[PDB]
Amino acid sequence: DKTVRWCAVSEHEATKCQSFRDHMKSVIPSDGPSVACVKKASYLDCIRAIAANEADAVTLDAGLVYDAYLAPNNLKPVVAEFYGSKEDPQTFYYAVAVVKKDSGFQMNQLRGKKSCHTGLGRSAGWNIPIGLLYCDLPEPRKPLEKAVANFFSGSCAPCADGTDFPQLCQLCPGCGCSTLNQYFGYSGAFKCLKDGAGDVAFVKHSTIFENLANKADRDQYELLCLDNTRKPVDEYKDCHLAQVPSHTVVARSMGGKEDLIWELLNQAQEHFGKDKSKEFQLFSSPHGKDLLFKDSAHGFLKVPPRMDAKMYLGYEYVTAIRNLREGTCPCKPVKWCALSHHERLKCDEWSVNSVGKIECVSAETTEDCIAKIMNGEADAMSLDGGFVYIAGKCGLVPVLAENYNAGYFAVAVVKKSASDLTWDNLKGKKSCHTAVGRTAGWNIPMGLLYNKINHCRFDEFFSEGCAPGSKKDSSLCKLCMGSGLNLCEPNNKEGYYGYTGAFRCLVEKGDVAFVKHQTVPQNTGGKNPDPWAKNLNEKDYELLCLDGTRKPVEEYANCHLARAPNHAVVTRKDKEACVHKILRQQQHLFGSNSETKDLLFRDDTVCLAKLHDRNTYEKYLGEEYVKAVGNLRKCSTSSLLEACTFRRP
Ligand SMILES: [Fe+3]
Ligand SMILES: [Os+3]
């Protein structure tokens, strides 16, 4: 059977599910998914039932998405409720800290200020801000209300115990837990800031726009960013305390059945969703509110498969709730992320010489390591600019750049004997790329190509090629040399992968190789001893100019495709200042004074350079680079980038 066992937490919910089950039987053919209805006492009990393989799916608020993820449950987000509109689905809200313009303080100066909360126990108004501020609170932090009352000088915290902690109700005497209190709820907390009672209101990003219709009034307000800067109120996506998903269907991380859950729910919304007007309605029910799904929901979005719960909830949210759950409070060592056994070994002996200031964690791919930097399992790694773009879109920032000598040169290599080849038309030729998504092998050359053909189907433009990372059936995998499952892989087990791998591809099979200005000189004239390169001379290879002319290999200064952004080390914003300092000290000791090749850092690198204002992927890579990659992701297959685009489109 293809049965999805839905888990209900009430008798009203069990009745709706049973109607859900019966109406779907009349719309789904017998080969399709069917509903079973399991009834438990609580959301916690449904989470355990799903982990125990007694049910398959339940819909949770963000806090319970966190609980469902913790061992031994290990549930995973799989389907999202969206709200608003099909054109602009709203899946998340943003908990923000609004302040009045020019009040003169930052997020790390909240102690002693006057605070306005929507209500004790609520997400944006209490659990997230107090979760983030937890270790800032005075000891003993238990009971929490007493610690908060001795952190803010006065507050309006609706539903707090004002009898025992009267500071919490200075701005709303009694801490009235209903609309009879003018500072209660989401507008109440913002009104507590507007009327001048408090200095800061902890609310949702939309409260400001629903209580202040005209932008002129809104310009008198700002938001507190976690980097201790302020931003305007409509920049909440770059300046919030946490991004919170409203209502998430969860499932077992292994054993699913994600596939079945989505095709059940997606069919259900197409026949019984909003505006479908049948006798059964998925997002309503005659008896009781919000049964199985929120009554305000407008449909379902499939959660991208790369995403786990920590990535879905976000780093900020997870920190806040873990602080409240665990209550644990201490620059600490920088945990580098390695991609190989050989790369891990280099880090290991680096860690032991750094006397603890460096630690090592491992992952199988670059994307896995990036996800570990995002969620805190890892801290830093050095990335090609193409991965810096991905790391940036996923919330990470560049901190230092590898300097090889303004960065390296992306050039197009051809064989000198091929007199006909020109940059103006290489259509129908055989291409060799370092990998899809990398700076010199893909983003620079194919970005320029996109401008003169205006599409991303480069396997239909070149006859064939080796572009490691392309889909195994593609014209651009046919020239690759990996065997078995390694054919066309963007790793070492594919011999045409990388700067020199793409040059070898040109030497043996291809017509053009997109690499960097030093690749040909380092792999010719006997410098590379491998049989494929040993007997090559660099005078038999030329560079393709943008002109349409050609020049010798070491004339790259005036025959390049573009200047490339250097590889850079990326990190979280909260670890930027510290990663900057530890790495500056460690290269003073182990710098200019790899067992295999280019492990952790490229071997051309001389120093790790500071970046000044170019501390953002948009400012580090440049407007031209980012616009070109935006053009190319119309054909990108990056699962990590898909997960990060789902949270920040
Ligand atoms: Fe590169
Ligand atoms: Os009833």
Side-chain angles (χ1 to χ4, degrees), residues 384-385 408 438-440 499 565 567 602:
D384 169 76
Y408 62 89
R438 314 283 171 96
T439 297
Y499 292 114
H567 294 204
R602 273 178 23 179

Side-chain angles (χ1 to χ4, degrees), residues 126-239:
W126 184 266
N127 295 340
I128 289 160
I130 304 310
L132 295 174
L133 293 162
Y134 184 79
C135 297
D136 282 18
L137 299 175
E139 289 177 299
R141 311 196 179 84
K142 185 78 206 240
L144 190 56
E145 281 173 88
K146 179 163 169 171
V148 178
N150 296 351
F151 180 84
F152 299 110
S153 62
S155 324
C156 175
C159 323
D161 172 4
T163 300
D164 289 303
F165 319 112
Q167 306 91 314
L168 290 180
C169 318
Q170 172 189 341
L171 318 190
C172 52
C175 280
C177 196
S178 68
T179 50
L180 227 39
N181 170 12
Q182 64 178 0
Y183 294 159
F184 165 85
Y186 276 88
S187 58
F190 175 74
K191 173 175 205 272
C192 168
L193 168 74
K194 185 195 44 136
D195 297 353
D199 301 289
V200 56
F202 299 109
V203 295
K204 290 171 181 182
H205 76 290
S206 48
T207 324
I208 313 94
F209 301 99
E210 291 162 336
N211 291 273
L212 285 185
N214 281 129
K215 165 155 203 306
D217 295 336
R218 288 197 303 269
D219 292 335
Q220 291 306 115
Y221 296 79
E222 312 176 285
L223 310 174
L224 298 186
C225 320
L226 292 174
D227 72 354
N228 304 309
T229 68
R230 294 179 176 207
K231 288 182 179 299
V233 299
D234 55 359
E235 324 209 4
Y236 49 88
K237 310 207 239 198
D238 309 293
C239 189

Side-chain angles (χ1 to χ4, degrees), residues 336 379-381 397-401 568-572 575-581 583 608-609 611-612 615-616 620:
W336 208 265
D379 289 335
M381 77 195 295
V397 291
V399 46
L400 294 163
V569 48
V570 304
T571 192
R572 287 179 316 276
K575 210 133 186 178
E576 155 182 57
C578 188
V579 153
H580 196 303
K581 264 301 169 134
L583 283 202
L608 291 178
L611 300 161
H612 304 343
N615 62 347
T616 289
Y620 178 75

Side-chain angles (χ1 to χ4, degrees), residues 3-11 13-15 17-18 21 35-42 45-50 53-58 292:
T3 301
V4 170
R5 292 164 301 172
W6 206 273
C7 195
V9 303
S10 76
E11 292 186 352
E13 272 207 347
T15 302
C17 181
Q18 288 172 332
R21 170 241 287 139
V35 183
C37 297
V38 177
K39 198 261 151 173
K40 293 313 215 237
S42 77
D45 279 321
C46 269
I47 289 176
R48 306 202 257 271
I50 295 168
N53 210 298
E54 277 164 49
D56 305 304
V58 71
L292 308 186

Side-chain angles (χ1 to χ4, degrees), residues 278-331 333-337:
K278 314 265 181 53
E279 79 157 10
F280 173 81
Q281 300 152 87
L282 203 58
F283 301 128
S284 153
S285 178
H287 200 26
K289 175 132 130 202
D290 291 327
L291 303 183
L292 308 186
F293 311 105
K294 271 184 199 332
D295 285 333
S296 63
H298 288 179
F300 297 121
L301 294 170
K302 198 212 215 308
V303 171
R306 184 46 177 93
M307 215 170 328
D308 76 317
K310 295 208 280 194
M311 183 181 315
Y312 200 57
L313 294 168
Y315 176 80
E316 287 75 19
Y317 187 85
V318 167
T319 317
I321 197 184
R322 207 179 29 229
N323 280 344
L324 289 187
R325 297 296 159 86
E326 293 166 9
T328 279
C329 291
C331 229
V334 170
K335 293 185 280 304
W336 208 265
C337 200

